[PDB]
């Protein structure tokens, strides 16, 4: 039995820096969800998601959910820096009753929801240089109203268009107005997208409406960190190997507890 037929049942906080999501998913903390304020600028070598995690903000979705989840996991850092964009002619800091922060109507802490200014929301030409030597990760969104009335009162534009572009890439999104089942008393949605701006490349935003603007970038280096889903508690112990069923000593050359591992782990074999 060089295979450890049963695991510890708990995950050791050592040596790998373990960050428990608890009531938060990585994406909710990435966007900044009211209950996820305590995850800002917080690093991790391994980030454990829980089955009990929800979202308590303004409903959204991500088309390529698996790419963005693996980006933030590989970097191991939620450190963003706020950059001052030039949002002349628009109303900033849009709030909603479905995203309650500090017992008040708020929004995602890292997203700026843009509405019209005096019923005029111009075409926006915005440039961001990225003078650094490391890949920036921008998180932006597109709001899908429920009616043509809602589209008009929010952006003063029946057909909004958004075109996030760099010297290398070019993304265009079109809103989708329509009646949608209420989510926490909200029939509207938001579509989340991401854009990597490489060093020396320029970020260009051309928008006419329905834009959930980003407030900053994130630092990505595709490091050693990763992400795992588990329900085993986090205990006070030291163990090189970590599995969704708990920590595991790495003294035996094989293992069958789970095919997902992290760190100095024995090679997996089946039952």
């Amino acid at each position, epitope marked *: 039995e060089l295979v450890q037929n049963s695991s510890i049942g708990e995950i050791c906080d050592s040596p790998h820096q373990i960050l428990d999501g608890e009531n938060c*998913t990585l*994406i*909710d903390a990435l966007l900044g969800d009211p209950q996820c304020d305590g995850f800002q600028n917080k690093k991790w070598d391994l980030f454990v998601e829980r089955s009990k*995690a*929800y*979202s308590n903000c303004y*409903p*959204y*979705d*991500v088309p390529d*959910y698996a790419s963005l989840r693996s980006l933030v996991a590989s970097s191991g850092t939620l450190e963003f820096n706020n950059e001052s964009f030039n949002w002349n002619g628009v109303t900033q800091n849009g709030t909603s009753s479905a995203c309650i922060r500090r017992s008040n109507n708020s929004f995602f802490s890292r997203l700026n929801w843009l509405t019209h200014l005096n019923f005029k929301y111009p075409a926006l030409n915005v440039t961001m240089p990225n003078n650094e030597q490391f890949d920036k990760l921008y998180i932006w969104g597109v709001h899908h109203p429920v009616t043509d009335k809602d589209q008009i009162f929010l952006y003063a534009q029946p057909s909004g268009r958004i075109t996030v572009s760099t010297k290398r890439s070019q993304q265009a999104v079109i809103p*989708n*107005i*329509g*009646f*949608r*089942p*209420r*989510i*926490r*008393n909200i*029939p509207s*949605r938001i579509s989340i997208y991401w854009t990597i701006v490489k060093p020396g490349d320029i970020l260009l935003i051309n928008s006419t409406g329905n834009l959930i603007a980003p407030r900053g970038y994130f630092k990505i280096r595709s490091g050693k960190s990763s992400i795992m889903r588990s329900d085993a508690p986090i205990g006070k112990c030291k163990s090189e190997c970590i599995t969704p069923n708990g920590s595991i000593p790495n003294d035996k050359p094989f293992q069958n507890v789970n095919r997902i591992t992290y760190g100095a782990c024995p090679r997996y074999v089946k039952q």
Partner: antibody
Amino acid sequence: QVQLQESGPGLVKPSETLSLTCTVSGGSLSIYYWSWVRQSPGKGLEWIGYISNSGSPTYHPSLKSRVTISLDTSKSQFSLKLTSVTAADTALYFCARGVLEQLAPDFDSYYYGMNVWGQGTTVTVSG
Amino acid sequence: DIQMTQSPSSVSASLGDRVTLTCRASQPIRSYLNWYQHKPGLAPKLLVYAVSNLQSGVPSRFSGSGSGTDFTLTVSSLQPEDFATYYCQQSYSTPYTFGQGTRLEIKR
């Protein structure tokens, strides 16, 4: 507002092909899907199949090849057809507006809600 | 291929009481389930999207919960105008199997 109106025969002789027609009122299409369900006398609701605005249908595997649903945005109408009908097909058929979404908290699979419904068209299959 | 089961089948509960209807699943669904309100001769109306997520025109006295295979609806104070017959769907797989239905009796 939004309302639905099924239209079709009230009686179909056995082995024939049912053909009902639902109607769009005053609502946008786009991401909506369009399903029908047949209510039995008391057996319980049974789902039939649903088409996207693009025109890609999926049946209910209980009806092996018996269902063919269609769509035509020119008249804002879409029909469902049941071939080789037998006495087991007596039911009360509805048409409903389904909305396909991916909720934020869990991305694991798709959600589906029948936001809008119609009153029903009683259909009997007897000789 | 994939069914569910809603308990009870038909139960009477007086005016002002508090009734709970439970939908049992074959496999864990997380929150891929829905609830509807079906009245005599009328089109069924949505009550619950996902779980505990209410629709327009639904009072706060309705409230559901549950995860995995077990989900419940709870009418805090039963009112006569509600009544109806209540179902659950399995919005997770392709058959989209619907619940058998639970009759609500006013009993007042």
